Swiss-Prot record:
It is linked to Immunodeficiency 97 with autoinflammation: An autosomal recessive disorder with variable features. Affected individuals have childhood-onset antibody defects, cytopenias, and T lymphocytic pneumonitis and colitis. Some patients may have features of hemophagocytic lymphohistiocytosis. It is found in: Cytoplasm; Cell membrane. InterPro entries: ARM-type_fold, C2_domain_sf, Kinase-like_dom_sf, PI3/4_kinase_cat_dom, PI3/4_kinase_cat_sf, PI3/4_kinase_CS, PI3K-type_C2_dom, PI3K_ABD. Its EC number is 2.7.1.137, 2.7.1.153, 2.7.1.154, 2.7.11.1. Pancreas, skeletal muscle, liver and heart. Keywords: Angiogenesis, ATP-binding, Cell membrane, Chemotaxis, Cytoplasm, Disease variant, Endocytosis, Immunity, Inflammatory response, Kinase, Lipid metabolism, Membrane, Nucleotide-binding, Phosphoprotein, Serine/threonine-protein kinase, Transferase. Gene3D superfamilies: 3.10.20.770, C2 domain, Phosphatidylinositol 3-/4-kinase, catalytic domain, Phosphatidylinositol 3-kinase Catalytic Subunit, Chain A, domain 4, Phosphatidylinositol 3-kinase, accessory domain (PIK). Belongs to the PI3/PI4-kinase family. Candidate target in therapy for inflammatory diseases. Selective inhibitors and protein ablation are anti-inflammatory in multiple disease models such as asthma, rheumatoid arthritis, allergy, systemic lupus erythematosus, airway inflammation, lung injury and pancreatitis. It comes from Homo sapiens (Human). This is Phosphatidylinositol 4,5-bisphosphate 3-kinase catalytic subunit gamma isoform. It catalyses: a 1,2-diacyl-sn-glycero-3-phospho-(1D-myo-inositol) + ATP = a 1,2-diacyl-sn-glycero-3-phospho-(1D-myo-inositol-3-phosphate) + ADP + H(+); a 1,2-diacyl-sn-glycero-3-phospho-(1D-myo-inositol-4,5-bisphosphate) + ATP = a 1,2-diacyl-sn-glycero-3-phospho-(1D-myo-inositol-3,4,5-trisphosphate) + ADP + H(+); a 1,2-diacyl-sn-glycero-3-phospho-(1D-myo-inositol 4-phosphate) + ATP = a 1,2-diacyl-sn-glycero-3-phospho-(1D-myo-inositol-3,4-bisphosphate) + ADP + H(+); L-seryl-[protein] + ATP = O-phospho-L-seryl-[protein] + ADP + H(+). ATP binds at residues 582-591, 617-625, 714-721. GO terms for molecular function: 1-phosphatidylinositol-3-kinase activity; 1-phosphatidylinositol-4,5-bisphosphate 3-kinase activity; 1-phosphatidylinositol-4-phosphate 3-kinase activity; ATP binding; ephrin receptor binding; identical protein binding; protein kinase activity; protein serine kinase activity.
């Protein structure tokens, strides 16, 4: 009966049906609100194409993949049983057209990945993947999966001229000397509309004021999505506690009556915005208030030359350049000229006096005349700007969500993480953005897979948002289908089993002793039978099904956080490879931070594809499963730069320029594969140099930088980030390029040519990276987020500068890395190792 919910609660990691932490019914209203858009999408999606989830793109095939193709021909090896045959196919051949040569379906060898539907084969991501790494395309003549397995179980305010007023009854803290006062804010966005304070009373375990705090704003002037933000400072001032309350609720009603709100502690931050109260009734500070103002909010239905240039200059500025009163007044008065420029929209809607009813009304009349916005080519950066912490207005936000509707599934996957994170900026649990994510996930198994893990990542470690996210996740699981529900169940079981082991093993050490290795092998063997399922989807690569542990190859690593090095057999017999699936299980790193950085790395890779560049980044899979815990895709055949330095020189900082180049030579079997490895490195190094510099994570110790035995360099472990260095371009990296100290080479000139083009290619997307960077810091970096933290990326991307000025600017950073040489790395050695 209700047993289905218990399953969902184990899948979610939180109990949606609990009501111990609500002062209203918004969450329950949202659950019931989402039934329709779920069922709507469940009824509309193509049952066949949903079962096989073809992963396709419409992006043009890049230059680097054309100049690799030969005579307009690619070979596809189709498999029967033991023997296989190879067929001549043109890039334009639809999977339906490949029937004639050989109803059945073409499933990729060793993966739950299908080549079906009305798209040319060049447009399938797996096909594009094989061409990049120079791999043969292997497929099987299989029977299309049954849609029955995906089957789903059947499921007036403006007539009110009164001033707003809040009765502060008092604060209550079960356990704690100075004085304390309460601050009440009417908020819209990050903007404080109206502020009133109490008097500083002695900070005891119970403090009562019983005061009426009358605001200057009127009830009619309160906009939808306005927060009463209640805060506690002590006294010399320092913030101690905060809590928020929506003044206009989910049913357009003015909030009314008695409230006792348990509050959040301290240590811009997305957590400061939440409508959730602290679930910890027993230990947290509370506050008691009264609102008493049946009141519902209604709904709605040439310039001089010198000024135009002032307007254009304002519109032209970056998203972090703040607006003065003068700028705002300009934007608002020329409302209609600003409306003609989509790029003006963030700035224009930040010039709105939201605490003024008639202005908001005019703004809404203004939104009804948005032909130019509706016709413009979708700009994600611009769209993302309207979904950040500076916009609390649903109608403003919904025109951003409108633009997201035209994104194809491939592009949704690119931005999905940060779209999920942007739910944290929504005033209300039921939003256009929450609904958009829900329907994109139910429309497609791959988006749906990742939507699950992203939401689950936050539910597991965010008291501030778990409730909202839990509701969306439940809404998702009730329409994804029995097949996936079973998939998710398997996966959840496996990782909750392996996390226990990770944490148990961590306890046993205070280096790796002889018996810890057997203790691990003992506990893994315990699981291999009862009760670990022998086949589960790899969360960061839903195309792979892992099978049995390779227990001989599993280890604990020589690091003070003692992570697990697990290896699995592939559960797919059709798998032509022999490779084990390698996953690191780790506690102690904030792998949320790794997720956000890795996702931006993917965006940079997609940016570079628009300009026919491939910089060979390895943005390894990574899933944060909980608080300072998660999994890491093992990149095979790889080792850290430091360990390469240790295995020749030893435990000293006397680093030798030659080692890396003669490490690569001994791993290359031919001279053909050596220069392939050298080239792959030149690109790799340049890819990471630029990407890390832009992000402010360039100065790293070199055992947090790795290389594969085929040249591919890649940074790892992105959690928590004398003189410095813009990035890591050490003399050993330079020796591979053929240069030494102060020279040039055919490979170094290439490296600069790649850097410059890559750097300027990101600069073409300045705004987008800026917004994703700001969002990242606010939603995933609880350590920091000051205004100055976010402003770093303006400098790094040299906003306002011409191309050549910025071209040189980077060439300088490269030159700085040569000037510094080993100094920074040597300092790091004295710092971390000693
Ligand atoms: C992506 C990747 N592939 C491989 N093979 N190995 C690692 N690796 C990581 N990964 C991460 C990622 C985030 N934190 N740590 N730590 C390591 C320590 C010593 C040797 C290898 C390590 N990472």
């Amino acid at each position: 009966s209700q047993a289905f919910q218990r399953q969902l609660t184990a899948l979610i990691g939180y109990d949606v049906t609990d009501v111990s932490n609500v002062h209203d019914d918004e969450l329950e209203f949202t659950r019931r609100g989402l039934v329709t858009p779920r069922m709507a999408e469940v009824a509309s999606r193509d049952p066949k194409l949903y079962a096989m989830h073809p992963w396709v793109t419409s992006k043009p095939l890049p230059e680097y993949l054309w100049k690799k193709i030969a005579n307009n021909c690619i070979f596809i090896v189709i498999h029967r049983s033991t023997t296989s045959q190879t067929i001549k196919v043109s890039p334009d051949d639809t999977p339906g057209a490949i029937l004639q040569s050989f109803d059945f379906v073409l499933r990729v060898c060793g993966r739950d990945e299908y080549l079906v539907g009305e798209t040319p084969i060049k447009n399938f991501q797996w096909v594009r993947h094989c061409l990049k790494n120079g791999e043969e395309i292997h497929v099987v003549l299989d029977t299309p999966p049954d849609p029955a397995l995906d089957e789903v179980r059947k499921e007036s305010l403006w007539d009110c001229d009164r001033k707003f007023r809040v009765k502060i009854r008092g604060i209550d803290i079960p356990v704690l000397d100075l004085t304390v006062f309460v601050e009440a804010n009417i908020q819209h966005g990050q903007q404080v509309l109206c502020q009133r304070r109490t008097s500083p009373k002695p900070f005891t375990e119970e403090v009562l004021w019983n005061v009426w705090l009358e605001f200057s704003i009127k009830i009619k002037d309160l906009p939808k999505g306005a927060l009463l933000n209640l805060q506690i400072y002590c006294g010399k001032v320092q913030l101690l506690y905060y809590v928020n309350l929506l003044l206009i609720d989910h049913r357009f009603l003015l909030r009314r009556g008695e409230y006792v709100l348990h509050m959040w502690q301290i240590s811009f931050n997305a957590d400061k915005l939440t409508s959730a109260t602290n679930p910890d009734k027993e230990n947290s500070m509370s506050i008691s208030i009264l609102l008493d103002n049946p009141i519902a909010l209604p709904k709605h239905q040439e310039m001089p030359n010198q000024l135009r240039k002032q307007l254009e200059a304002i519109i032209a500025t970056d998203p972090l350049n703040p607006l003065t009163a003068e700028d705002k007044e300009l934007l608002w008065h020329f409302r209609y000229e600003s409306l003609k420029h989509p790029k003006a929209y963030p700035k224009l809607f930040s010039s709105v006096k939201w605490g003024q009813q008639e202005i908001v009304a005019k703004t809404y009349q203004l939104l009804a005349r948005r032909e130019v916005w509706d016709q413009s080519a979708l700009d994600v950066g611009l769209t993302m700007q309207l979904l950040d912490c500076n916009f609390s207005d649903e109608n403003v936000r919904a025109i951003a969500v409108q633009k997201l509707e035209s994104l194809e599934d491939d592009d949704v996957l690119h931005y999905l993480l940060q779209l999920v994170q942007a739910v944290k900026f929504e005033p209300y649990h039921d939003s256009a953005l929450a609904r958009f994510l829900l329907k994109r996930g139910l429309r497609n198994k791959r988006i749906g897979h990742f939507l699950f893990w992203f939401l689950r990542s936050e539910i597991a470690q965010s008291r501030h948002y778990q409730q909202r996210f839990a509701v969306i996740l439940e809404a998702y699981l009730r329409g994804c289908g029995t097949a996936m529900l079973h998939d998710f169940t398997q996966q959840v079981q496996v990782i909750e089993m392996l996390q226990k082991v990770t944490l148990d093993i961590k306890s046993l050490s205070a280096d790796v002793s002889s018996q810890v290795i057997s203790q691990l092998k003992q506990k893994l063997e315990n699981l291999q039978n009862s009760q670990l399922p022998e086949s589960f989807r790899v969360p960061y690569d839903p195309g792979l099904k892992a099978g049995a542990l390779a227990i001989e190859k599993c280890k604990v690593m020589a690091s003070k956080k003692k992570p697990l090095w697990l290896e699995f057999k592939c559960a797919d017999p059709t798998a032509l490879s022999n490779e084990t699936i390698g996953i690191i299980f780790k506690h102690g790193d904030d792998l949320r931070q790794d997720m956000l950085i890795l996702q931006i790395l993917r965006i940079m890779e997609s940016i570079w594809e628009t300009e026919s560049l491939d910089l060979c980044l390895l943005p390894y899979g990574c899933i944060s499963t909980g608080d300072k815990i998660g999994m890491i895709e093992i990149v095979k055949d790889a080792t850290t730069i430091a360990k390469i330095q240790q295995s020749t020189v030893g435990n000293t900082g006397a680093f030798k320029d030659e080692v890396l180049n003669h490490w690569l030579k001994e791993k290359s079997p031919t001279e053909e594969k050596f220069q392939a490895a050298v080239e792959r490195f030149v690109y790799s190094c340049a890819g990471y140099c630029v990407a890390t510099f832009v992000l402010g994570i360039g100065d790293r110790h070199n055992d947090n930088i790795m290389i594969t035995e085929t040249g591919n360099l890649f940074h790892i472990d992105f959690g928590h980030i004398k003189e410095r260095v813009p990035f890591v371009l050490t003399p050993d990296f330079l020796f591979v390029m053929g240069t030494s100290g102060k020279k040039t080479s055919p490979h170094f000139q290439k490296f600069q040519d790649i850097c410059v083009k890559a750097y300027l290619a990101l600069r073409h997307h300045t705004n987008l990276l800026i917004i994703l960077f700001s969002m990242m810091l606010m939603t995933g970096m609880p350590q920091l987020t000051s205004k100055e933290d976010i402003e770093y990326i303006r400098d790094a991307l040299t906003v306002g500068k011409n191309e050549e000025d910025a071209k040189k600017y980077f060439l300088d950073q490269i030159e700085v890395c040569r000037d510094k040489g080993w100094t920074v790395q040597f300092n790091w050695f004295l710092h971390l190792v000693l």
